[PDB]
Structure formats: C-alpha cells, structure tokens
Paper text:
Here, we determine the protein substrate, structure, and mechanism of a type III-E CRISPR-associated protease (CASP) from the marine anaerobe Desulfonema ishimotonii, reveal insight into its natural function in coordinating a transcriptional response to foreign genetic material, and engineer it for novel RNA sensing applications in vitro and in human cells. We identified that the largest protein, Csx30, is specifically cleaved in response to a target RNA. Csx29 consists of a three-helix bundle N-terminal domain (NTD), a TPR domain with eight repeats, and a protease region containing a pseudo-caspase (CHAT1) and active-caspase (CHAT2) domain that resembles separases.
By comparing the inactive and active complexes we observed a major structural change within the eighth repeat of the TPR domain, which we term the activation region (AR). The AR is bipartite, composed of AR1 (aa 313–325) and AR2 (aa 356–411), which stack with each other in the inactive state. In the active complex, AR1 senses the 3’ end of target RNA (position −4 and −5) through base stacking interactions and pushes the AR2 helices away, preventing a steric clash. The target RNA in our active complex is non-complementary to the direct repeat (DR) and the structure reveals that this is an important feature. In the active complex, the kinked target RNA site at position −2 is stabilized by base stacking interactions, provided by both Cas7–11-Y718 and Csx29-Y398 within AR2. Prominent salt bridges formed between R394-E672 and D395-R625 help position the loop containing the catalytic C658, and the strand containing the catalytic H615, respectively. Together, these structures reveal an allosteric cascade initiated by the 3’ end of DR-mismatched target RNA, triggering the AR within the Csx29 TPR domain, and transducing structural changes to the Csx29 CHAT2 domain to coordinate active site residues. As the loop is also flexible, it is not well resolved, but its density places it near the active site of Csx29 positioning it for cleavage.
Author numbering:
A (entry chain B): 2 to 108, 117 to 251
B (entry chain A): 1298 to 1601
C (entry chain A): 154 to 237, 260 to 319, 326 to 834, 842 to 918, 929 to 992
Write the structure that this text describes.
RNA sequence: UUGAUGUCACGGAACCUUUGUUGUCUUCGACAUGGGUA
RNA sequence: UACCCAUGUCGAAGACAACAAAGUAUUU
C-alpha cells in the first residue's frame, strides 16, 4: 500500500479552505495509523517525509483542533454514503469491515447523525437463527437510539435524527423488545414532516396510519416509483395501503 | 548560527535522527506521524539495515571473546607465584576530543571533515618506561589519570558471530570488514592514541543453516561472497573508491622495524624539551585555518 | 434489615460490583457476562427480622416451619445460618517539585516506582545513590528546598504510616495520583472502547413453562469433603477496579487485601471438568425448565465455600509486551502490566454433595482425583502458567439424611456449617478420597525442560532497577514465593517470554497455502498455530510455566558507552549499564522447568512434528533468550526435554582461504612527527532502501549461519573491569583490572560489535550511525580590531 | 423496605490472544578568561 | 579610533530515543 507516500501526495495538493483536500488528508493519515496498529507488512516502511519544514508546517496546520474535527465528520459522511451505494455488491465480511471502520473512525450533529446511522446499519447485518435473536442486534439498535437522543434533546424537529430513532425503535420491536418510551409523540412529529425519504419510511407511515387511523399519507405510498430492486417488498406495502 | 548537523550533507546524517530543522517539533507530540519528520525520505543505509535501529532489529549477533592460553602480561605481577594477574602501568592524561579544532570557525566553508581513525605506532614503549609520550618527562599520579592492567602482544582470543537473512554481498563485506588484509589491523580498547589496542582477526570457520535439520560447512563459498561484495561496491561507486584507499592507509600496521613517532603537540613550544611547535604556534603555521581540514583529512600528514 | 438500620453513602460504601461471565466449553472463551454487587460477610454478617404467626395455626405447622428454617442453608447467594490527608498533600508537593525543576518527563517512572514501595517502608532507606555514592541520584534527589528522598523518608517515619497497611494505602494512592498527572501531559486519560459486545446479558425466565411433579424418592445422603487447595504456580483471578487506572490487569482481593478464591470460579471449573469427564458439552440456554444433562444434575447437588487466604502481601507487577514479527520490535501500543498472586498460598476447601446415589457420583470422584494429582487448573491466564493447584490433605464422610435420628441430629446442628460445628464435624471425617470406578486419565501431560546457556542473561525489569540499592539502569526479573506470611525472592525467566520465543520459532518455518503463519490474520482460520497456541477466538492447548535457575547465581554489572563517529569520544548523554546474570563456557547458567501439553496434541503426529522442528532450531542456537542478544546475551548451549516418550524429541539432534596481501603504501620519515588521528572523508552518495528485509521468515536465497573468529593482539591491550576503580590500592587516582568473567579473561561482545561496525560503516559509505546532531559550536573572540572588535557596538 | 397458593440464579470461570523488547566500542587534547596602550 | 595580545590550566558524559495498552468472526 505504502501509506507514507499517500501522505506526501496529499500534502502537496492540500489547501485548508477546500473540503476535498482535508477529506483526503484525514483519510490518508487515518489509514497510516490503522496500518501501524495492525502490525501490517506496511510497517516495514522505514522512509520519512521530504521537505521537512514545509511538511511540518502543513501537518501542524492540519492538526488544528477545528480543522481536523471538521474533516472528521465529512470523511465519515462520505464513507457512509459510499457504503450505502455499494452495500449490495459487497459480501458480509467486507460490509462489516466497512461499517466498523466508520464507527472506529468517528469514535457536532453531523458526526453524531453519521455514527447513529452507521450503528443502525451494523445492526441490520445480524439475522435471527432459529427462534433466537442475537444480542448484538439489540445492542446496536440501542446505541443508535442513544446517539440520536443527543440531537433530539436540543432539536426535536431534526428529521434525520428522528427518522433514525424511529427505525431503531421499530427494529427493537421486531427483536421482541418493547418500544422505547415516547415512541407515540416522536412518531407524531414524523407525520408532521410528511415526506418519504427512503424505503423504510413507508413502514413508518403505515405505523402512523394504524395508530392515528389517518389515511392522508397512503396516496404517497401508492404513487411510489416501481424502479426498485426489492420490488416484492414495495408491493407488500402497496397491499397494506390498499 | 547552525547546529552541527547542518555542517554535513543531509545524506550523511543518521537515518533515524534528531530534529535539526528550525521549529518546535513538539507541536505534533500527540500524533503518530511525528515520527515521519525524523526519518530520511529514502530509508535505511547498509549499516542501518545490517546492525539495526530503534525501529528495526539487527541481523548480526556478537558473542563474548575468551582468551585461549595462559595470559602474557605487559608487566610482571607483584607476586611471582601467580601468573594469572599482571602488574600496573600508569597512563598519561586522557582528555576529551575537541571538534572546534577540526571545524575552525563559524564560516559555512568548514564542514564536518569525516570519520576519525587512530593510527598504529609504538608509543606504548615510552609509557611502559614511565615517561610521557610527547615530553619524555616522568608521568605522575593525579586524580585525572589512570593505572591499568594490560595484556601484551601475542595473546589470542576466540569468538563467534551469528547472522540471519544476509545477502551474499553483505556477508562478503562483513568478512572483509572482519579479516581486512595481511598488513592491516583493527584498534580496540582504551588509549588508542597512545599505541595500545592493535588487533588482527582471522576467520576460522563459516557454517550455514540449510534448513531446520541440516547445517553445512560454508568455507568453500567465501571467495564467491567476497567477489559479490566488491562487485556491489563497483555498482555503487564505479572507479571513485578513494575513501577505501584512505581507510586502508589508516589501518596500515608499520612493519620492517619501522618506528613512526606519533603524539599530540604541547600547548606551547616552551613546554616541550624536544623543541617542536605547540598548538599555539601550529594554529598559524602549518595548521592555519585555511589549511587545517586538508592536512587532517590526509593520512599520515606530519605536523613536525 | 441491619440491626439499628444505619445509613451509608451508597452501594459502593458497603460492597463492590464484579463482573461474572459465562465461558463457552469448546472454545474456552467467554460468551457473555453480567454484573452484581458483592457484600463481604465480615463487615455485614447479620440481618434481623420477625415472623408473625396467628394463634390458630397448628402445632405441626409450627414444627414444620422451625425445621424448615433450620434446614434452609443458603440465601442471597451465600451459605447462612438462621437462628431464633497525607497522600494528597505529598502528591501536590512532589508535583510542584517536578514542575518547578522542569523534570516532568520522569512523572510516569516515579509513579510506578513509588507504587512498588507499597510492600515495605524499609525500601525507602535502600533507594540508590549516584555512581559516586552520593545523594545526587537523578530521580530521588530531584529538587536538591527538600528532595523527593527527604519527602519519602519523612513520610516513612510518620507514626500514622508505621502500620504496614497504612503504608501500602499511602503508596497506592500516591502512585495513582502521579499516574493521572502523567496522563494529563499526554493529552488526558483516554481508552479505546469496544464497538459491540459490551452490554450485559441477563437470563430471561420462561412464563409459558409447564408444571411437573417429580418423586425423587426418600433415599437422600449428604457427603462432605474437606481439604486444602495449594497454589503450585502463581495465579490470576481477574477483577478490575474502575477507580484504579494505573494497573492494566488486576487480581481479586478481599476488602482487607487477602487473596480470594471465589465460589463462582470454583463452580465454573467443576462444571468444565465434569463435561471433560463425560466428554459432551452442555448446550442449554439460560431460562426454561432445568437442564437434565448428566453434568447439570450433579451440579444441582454441589455446594462449595468461598475461600480466602491468611497471606495478604501485595501482588507482583509483571511487564508484558508484544513483538511486531516484521520489524522484530515492539508493536504500536503493545506495552502493558499485570498483577500476579504468588505461589504457595493455601486456601481452605469444602465441598458438599446431596443426592440419592450411595456417595459421590463416579464422575466427581474422578475429577477430585485429578485435582489431588495437581491438575486443578483453576484461574485465568492458564496459557502462561497461571493457576495450577493441588488438592491436599483431603478427608470425607457421608451422612444419611433418610435416617430420622441422623436427620434430627443434622437439624439440631444446622448441618455443622458454622465454624464451631465444622470443627466438630472434622473430628469424624476419614482420611483420603473414595476411589473412582470408571476412572479416566487426566487430559494434560507434563514435559520437563532443561536449558544450558554459556553466556550472560537478562530478562529486564526497569522498575525494580529504579529502587534497588545497586542503581544500574536495568536488572533481571525476580518473583516471590509465599511461606506462611514470608516472601522469598527467586530469579526466573518469565513464562510469557518463553512462550513468545517458542511460538515465534514454530510460526517462522510453517506455511498455510504458501503464506507464513506469521503473516496471517487468523480469522476463520484452522492453521496449526491456532490449533496449538490458540488465538483471540479459542484457548491454546499448551501451557508454559516459569523457568528457574539452578544453584542461584548472583548478578554482575557491566558498563556501556556510545561513541560519536566524528569525535571518537563518548556521545553526549549515552552512558549506561546493566546487571545481567553471569554465565560463561566454564560455568554456564542452568534453566529448569516444565510445560503442560494436552494429550490430543501429543497423539497428533503432525503437531508433534511441528513442535519438534521448532525446538530443534532452538537447540541449534537460532533463538536466544531474553534481551540484548545483539551483544552476546542469552545464547542457548543446548535444550532438552523429557516426558514425551520421544514423540517430540525424536527430531532434535575445506580450509578458509588466505587473506590477500594489502596494496596500501605509507611512507614514514624517521625524523618527522605525525598526528595520532586522521579523518576519512566519505563519498557523496549513500545507498538507501525504503523497505528492508523482514524478520518474519527465513527468506529464500539469503544466508543464515555462524562465523567463528580468531583475534590476536599486535600491541598491548587494555579492556578494563570498571566495576572497581581502586584495584591497585596498597577524588583519588583510579585503577582497574582487565575484564574478567568467573576469573576468565574475556572481551565483551559490545566492544567487538562497535569496533567492527565502525569499519563496516566506512566500507559501505553508510551514515554516521552515532553523531550528536543538535550540538551548537562556539569559539572565543580574539583581540583583533579590524576583523572582530570594530563590528561589536555598545 | 416484601406481599403471599408458584423465584432451579450454588442457572453463568472475567474468560480468551500478546517475548520488557529494539538501537548504543567504558571511551578520550587543545582549550579557558577579558582587556591593555596611545 | 587605531595598535597589541597576555596567562597556564583542566576532566567530560552517568542514560537517551520508541512503544505506556490493544484486540476479541454469527454466516449462502
Ligand atoms: Zn544509516
Ligand atoms: Zn446441561
Ligand atoms: Zn491461524
């Protein structure tokens, strides 16, 4: 891999006002540290960085607290996006490694939201076997809820945090746990938003339909686009709506 | 204005070294990439690859040497009934080297001149007679000088070197650095500048691990390894191997009843009953600043 | 309730929360865990209450109630009977001294060293002096106002701290405070969290379970077994105090600092060994009707006492590290330390079994025989030799509780389960154990090891070096054995280090699908290294103990110095020394010990072949023991094993050319005088490689072996013995003998390494390996108007 | 500070993996100090 | 704001750099 060389290339290009530059620099430095912690074969690289005063000045500027902490959330969000794109081309082992890399890197509302979504997706990988659910599935969903509640304690209108909280609450119910408290109130806020962001939301608006006995949002579902991979699941939601 | 690391080419500085560039490197103390500012951009030189560094274990092991025969001492012991202890010899003052002599001034003209080596000579005969190497006056006890028990010439030792994952050219140049050539010697131990410590090494045997259950005699392959070593030096440096020649001239052992006189000057010629110049006279005569680094880097250049 | 209903600040005022785990039988690794508070009975032995009875209740109901209360023998998880300041001030002062004198870099070392003083206040008088025998040591005389040495001497002489327990408490609190101050300098105390698997798991009972009536019969007997469990190795029952950060791995202790053998561990080990006997794992989950497998039915009759030791000295602290196989150096972050309990501690042991069979079931008789033969492997860290016990002085008898006379006698005495009743019951127990019928051999076998070294040896401990009177930079490992309440020191080679060496020897010469076993990650892996030595997913099948030295040698100290390649003198701060154990060809060091190997490994010819190959290479001298083998320490003369029936040990078994004549010419003039030294000017080009040869295997095409050499003196040689600078006595005039080891004239390996390294550096045109880069030169001005003095202005 | 016709929690080993290790010749010569006289 | 030197004495280095805990599959 030679991650030291990658750090040189980024340090040549990078300027501190530019998101992509800092995203790339943070990514390269994290990969270097990861290879050290793994005792990888890349640890045989004994070389250092060239142009020492320039490299020192640029690294010293990057490691400013606000610069690196800013870059952290953006790198996490970029990885989370690229995961949710390539999720269905990956095998289980490498889906797992991707998500756990995101979690370890991120361990600001952008960071918390990204970490909550990463924990939600890590939990989805576990599947029940026989009449037993893995404990780590419940653990992951509870940690997602815990992260979501930092945002919602100070901004109850935040749609993404609210939706992640509601998804995790529905998975808790699926595992045979109870709903967490104030599920009804938060599920009522979601209906005050009233728009489908992703396929999971269709299952929330049906829960709202069955609870408040309100039919307004069913026409959104019946008009949803058919160009989806999990067509059978969408058709099952269509049947419930009808 | 400069730290001494800036008075030599950056290529000859240690591979894994200290921060000499202008700045306060402690600003990155919390993060792993700080180490990359302390390492050469192109990696490890041969001696670092063979003998190792703080971040890379070495590939050779040096064992203790043991004397083979009954000792032959420089001076007979106080009790003639005991041959296993020798008598004392008193050395003249041992003082620290001064780099300000080799680097005469703040002018950027003056570099680090090179690697120090001590020459071979017999001033130990004067010390055995109890006299100072330069002045010839009797040495006196002081809190600052030493008395030692010293072996004579002709004592023999044996020791072993273990090695692992060497290239053939590496083993060839290691054998070359051990045995040298007939007419050359190493220096070892205390008081090298007073003529003590000339030693010669000879290989007795090389054995090789073929695998976990077979070892084999390697004596037959020694010439091939030496050939590859010298071919490697040609590949790196082509014809311009002058540093080898200067090294050999400093490793040369005087033979044929030759008797070089080797000593440091006195501080002033009035202090020397032989009548040669001291440092205070030399520093504006032969070893004047514009001439000093050339004379010091030319083997066996006389000062008087 | 407690009598008088007193109040406390909270649960932590009365007890400690401890993790209790569940171990998967086949992998040997924990599946999950839960937590509870434990409250010690010596602090809170008693609760009191009332039963209120209506007058119309019959006499027979009253009799049944009273007999039931006497028969009830356990509640809230405990066997029972039913009847009817300085350290803060010192830390602040020492921190002020350190920061006033700009010596804060030593905070961590001081914190660890002061913690080490907790075992005896007399150690304060023993703290090292400087090399001149004077109070200017670089740690203890900082501040030379008062010094640290004076602060500690005053504290040790404070009458409140004269009690050993108070001194231990003082040292521990002070060490923790200095540790936390040292952590601030590194950016604060921060510890990496686990991604997932960090939550407790509680068993869920089943509410749809069906009701059953079961007879079990009137035949019912109780067997009592009494004895001792004796520590034949050091042992480790892990338990972390969350408020104690300084130590990474910690031992379980009572509140008054006695060592504890907990009930939970003993039950877990009994269940494990019973499944080993029957040779069938139990698969049952928590909750639902009780499991009916043969192990669970026995465990439902068993009772065991929680036990503690009379011995209460502080634990040892062991250093531990991990080596990166590619570079041959410590891996990033892999330095940690461990508390260990000494061998020789004795625990009371009492077991009881209730059942309808005529005695102990045959499986339990076999397991107790295994324990009596010294294969009670009870504690954690088994792979590195911790936790082997022998059951000693066993006695037993069976009481028949179907007999009404016996049963009334039993009820009258609460089953003889209190201290006084126990001392009566012991008068009627019979010596020995009941012999098993269907006996099965123990699953582990002992291999005896003996190693011979013809060189010095060190297994370094710098913290012990910081407090020992001798005052070198590093000294060798020692450990302590308990006798009564006395502690005796023994020089040893750590079990962990020896395991590491053997594991490396095995891994470097085997492959899986053409990849060395050193390079694998070992996820979903079935390689022989996982099979023998274990992994992060399953326990290993070979257990290494510490090795001890025969005939108790005494350490020797050697001096060292690094030489600047330009000046030819001592490099600025790099003068140092060590204290290895002396070993030589005439008087070699002898190491003895043993390791335990599971019998299914000895039965497998392939695994035996692998171990044999590795120990053959250790016997050949390719793997030195301990540190600093670059300068000649740790060299194995031979290694031999006994006990395998030769299943492992079956595998363990042209003149040099003339040197050329030199071409060098030097011409000497008889009247001239020459300088004692000259400088070799290097070539401009240094040849570097970004990625040197890795240590993780013997690479094909490269060479490995030994060079044997002859050295001859041409002029007189001085190699001094600097351990004594006054040898020729009839600041003073110093004098030295020639270097000797066990009265043999020798040259150290470090001298030869440095000598040859200088010439090799010059021949290959290498960098100046040793060189004082950061020195700043300066020169005197001269009395010269034009060139100097007219440029300096007021 | 329980609630009562129903508690196998003595129903659960803080267990598992990690080499206090890597690098270093007990060496060795010119240097200190600040004026003085017109 | 030009010129000129004068005196002979003396031990140094005594550990430094790195790591300071990290990991611990539930499945096409
Ligand atoms: Zn180098
Ligand atoms: Zn069972
Ligand atoms: Zn494996």
């Amino acid at each position: 891999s030679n991650p030291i060389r990658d750090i040189q290339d980024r340090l040549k290009t990078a300027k501190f006002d530019n998101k992509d530059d800092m995203m790339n620099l943070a990514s390269s430095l994290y990969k270097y540290e990861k290879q050290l912690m793994d005792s990888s074969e890349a640890t045989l690289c004994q070389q250092g960085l060239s142009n020492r005063p320039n490299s020192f000045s640029q690294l010293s500027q990057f490691r400013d607290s606000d610069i690196q902490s800013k870059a952290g959330g953006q790198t996490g969000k970029f990885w989370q996006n690229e995961y949710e794109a390539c999720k269905n081309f990956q095998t289980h082992k490498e889906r797992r490694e991707t998500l756990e890399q995101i979690i370890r890197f991120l361990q600001d509302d952008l960071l918390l939201k990204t970490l909550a979504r990463a924990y939600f997706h890590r939990g989805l990988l576990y599947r029940p076997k026989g009449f037993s659910v893995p404990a780590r599935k419940v653990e992951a969903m509870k940690k997602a809820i815990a992260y979501c509640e930092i945002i919602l304690d100070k901004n109850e209108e935040e749609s993404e945090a609210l939706r992640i909280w509601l998804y995790a609450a529905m998975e808790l119910r699926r595992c045979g746990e109870e709903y967490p408290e104030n599920f009804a109130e938060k599920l009522f806020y979601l209906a005050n938003d009233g728009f489908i962001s992703e396929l999971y939301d269709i299952r929330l608006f049906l829960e709202y339909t069955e609870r408040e006995e309100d039919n307004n949002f069913l026409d959104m579902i019946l008009q949803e686009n058919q160009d989806r991979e999990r067509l059978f699941e969408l058709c099952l939601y269509k049947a419930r709506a009808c | 204005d400069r730290m001494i690391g800036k008075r030599m080419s950056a290529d000859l500085r240690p591979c894994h070294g200290d921060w000499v560039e202008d700045g306060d490197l402690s600003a990155l103390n919390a993060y792993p990439e700080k180490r990359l500012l302390l390492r050469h951009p192109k990696g490890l030189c041969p001696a670092c690859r063979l003998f190792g560094t703080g971040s890379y274990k070495g590939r050779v092991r040096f064992g203790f040497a043991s004397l083979e025969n009954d000792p032959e001492w420089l001076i007979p012991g106080k009790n003639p009934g005991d041959p296993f202890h020798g008598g004392p010899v008193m050395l003249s003052l041992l003082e620290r080297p001064r780099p300000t002599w080799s680097i005469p001034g703040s002018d950027n003209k003056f570099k680090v001149p090179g690697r120090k080596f001590y020459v071979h000579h017999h001033a130990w005969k004067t010390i055995k007679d109890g006299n100072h190497p330069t002045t010839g006056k009797a040495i006196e006890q002081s809190p600052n000088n030493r008395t030692v028990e010293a072996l004579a010439g002709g004592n023999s030792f044996s020791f072993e070197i273990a090695f692992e994952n060497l290239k053939e050219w590496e083993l060839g140049l290691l054998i070359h650095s051990l045995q040298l050539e007939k007419g050359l010697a190493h220096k070892l131990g205390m008081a090298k500048s007073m003529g003590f410590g000339s030693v010669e090494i000879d290989v007795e045997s090389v054995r090789l691990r073929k695998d976990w259950k077979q070892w084999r005699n390697g004596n037959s392959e020694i010439p091939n390894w030496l050939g590859k070593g010298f071919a490697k030096l040609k590949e790196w440096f082509r014809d311009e191997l002058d540093f080898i020649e200067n090294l050999k001239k400093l490793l040369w052992f005087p033979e044929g009843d030759q008797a070089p006189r080797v000593c440091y000057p006195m501080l002033r010629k009035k202090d020397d009953p032989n009548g040669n110049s001291g440092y205070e006279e030399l520093k504006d005569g032969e070893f004047k600043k514009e001439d000093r680094q050339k004379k010091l880097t030319t083997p066996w250049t006389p000062w008087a | 309730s407690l009598p008088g209903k007193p109040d406390f600040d909270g649960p932590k005022a009365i007890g400690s929360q401890r993790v209790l785990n569940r171990v998967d039988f086949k992998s040997g690794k924990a599946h999950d865990f839960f937590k509870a508070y434990e409250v010690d009975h010596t602090r809170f032995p008693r609760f009191e209450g009332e039963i209120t009875i209506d007058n119309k209740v019959s006499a027979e109901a009253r009799k049944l109630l009273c007999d039931s209360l006497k028969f009830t023998d356990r509640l809230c998880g405990a066997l029972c009977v039913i009847r009817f300041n300085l350290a803060e001030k010192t830390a602040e002062q020492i921190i002020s001294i350190l920061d006033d004198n700009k010596k804060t870099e030593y905070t961590r070392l001081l914190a660890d060293a002061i913690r080490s003083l907790r075992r005896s206040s007399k150690l304060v008088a023993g703290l090292p002096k400087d090399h001149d025998g004077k109070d200017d040591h670089y740690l203890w005389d900082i501040g030379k106002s008062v010094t640290i040495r004076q602060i500690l001497t005053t504290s040790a002489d404070t009458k409140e701290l004269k009690n050993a327990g108070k001194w231990r408490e003082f040292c521990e609190k002070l060490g923790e405070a200095l540790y936390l101050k040292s952590k601030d300098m590194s950016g604060g105390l921060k510890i990496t969290r686990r991604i997932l698997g960090d939550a407790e798991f509680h068993g869920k009972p089943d509410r749809l379970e069906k009701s059953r009536s079961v007879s079990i019969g009137s035949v019912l007997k109780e067997t009592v077994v009494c004895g001792e469990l004796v520590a034949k190795t050091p042992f480790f029952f892990g338990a972390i105090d969350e408020d104690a950060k300084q130590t990474a791995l910690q031992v379980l202790l009572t509140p008054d600092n006695k060592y504890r053998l907990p009930r939970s561990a003993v039950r877990g080990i009994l269940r494990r060994d019973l499944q080993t006997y029957f040779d069938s794992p139990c698969n049952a989950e928590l909750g639902g009707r009780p499991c009916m497998c043969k192990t669970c039915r026995i465990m439902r009759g068993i009772t065991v006492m929680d036990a503690r030791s009379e011995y209460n000295a502080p634990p040892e602290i062991r250093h531990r590290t991990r080596i990166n196989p590619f570079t041959g150096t410590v891996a990033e972050g892999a330095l940690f330390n461990m508390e260990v309990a000494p061998e020789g501690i004795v625990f009371p042991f009492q077991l009881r079994y209730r059942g309808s069979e005529d005695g102990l079931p045959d499986a339990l008789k076999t397991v107790l025989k295994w324990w009596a033969e010294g294969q009670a492997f009870m504690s954690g860290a088994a792979s590195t030799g911790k936790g082997r016990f022998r059951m000693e002085n066993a006695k037993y008898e069976t009481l028949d509780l179907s007999d009404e006379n016996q049963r009334n006698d039993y009820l009258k005495n609460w089953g003889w389960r209190d201290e006084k009743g126990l001392e009566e019951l012991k008068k009627r127990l019979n010596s020995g154990l009941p012999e098993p019928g269907n006996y099965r051999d123990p699953k582990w076998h002992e291999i005896n090891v003996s190693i011979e070294m013809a060189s010095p040896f060190i297994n370094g401990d710098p913290i012990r070096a910081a407090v020992d009177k001798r005052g070198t930079a590093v000294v060798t490992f020692v450990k302590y054995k308990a006798e009564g309440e006395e502690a005796k020191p023994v020089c040893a080679y750590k079990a962990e280090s020896f395991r590491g060496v053997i594991r490396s020897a095995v891994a470097r010469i085997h492959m899986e699908d053409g990849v060395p076993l050193t390079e694998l990650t070992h996820s979903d892996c079935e390689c022989l290294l996982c099979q023998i030595f274990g992994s992060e997913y399953e326990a290993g099948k070979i257990r290494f103990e510490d090795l001890v030295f025969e005939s108790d040698p005494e350490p020797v100290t050697f001096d060292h110095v690094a030489i600047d390649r330009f000046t030819g003198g001592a490099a600025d701060k790099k003068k140092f020394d060590d204290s290895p154990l002396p070993g030589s060809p005439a008087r070699p060091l002898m190491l003895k010990g043993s390791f335990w190997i599971r019998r299914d490994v000895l039965e497998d010819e392939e695994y035996c072949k692998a171990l044999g190959k590795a120990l053959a290479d250790v016997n050949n001298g390719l793997y030195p023991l301990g540190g600093k083998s670059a300068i000649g320490y740790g060299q194995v003369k031979s290694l031999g094993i006994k006990g395998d029936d030769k299943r492992i040990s079956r595998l363990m078994n042209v003149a040099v050319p003339e040197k050329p004549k030199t071409d060098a010419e030097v011409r000497i003039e008889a009247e001239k005088v020459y300088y004692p030294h000259y400088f070799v000017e290097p070539h401009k080009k240094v040849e570097r490689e970004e990625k040197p040869c890795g240590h993780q295997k013997f690479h094909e095409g490269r060479l490995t072996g030994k060079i044997r050499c002859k050295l001859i003196t041409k002029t007189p040689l001085i190699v001094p013995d600097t351990s004594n600078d006054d040898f020729f006595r009839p600041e003073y005039h110093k004098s030295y003998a020639f270097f000797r080891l066990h009265k043999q004239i020798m040259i150290p390996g470090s001298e030869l390494r440095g000598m040859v390294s200088s010439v090799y550096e010059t021949v290959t045109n290498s960098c100046f390996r040793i060189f004082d880069e950061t020195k700043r030169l300066s020169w005197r001005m001269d009395a010269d108007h034009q060139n100097v003095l007219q440029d300096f202005l007021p």
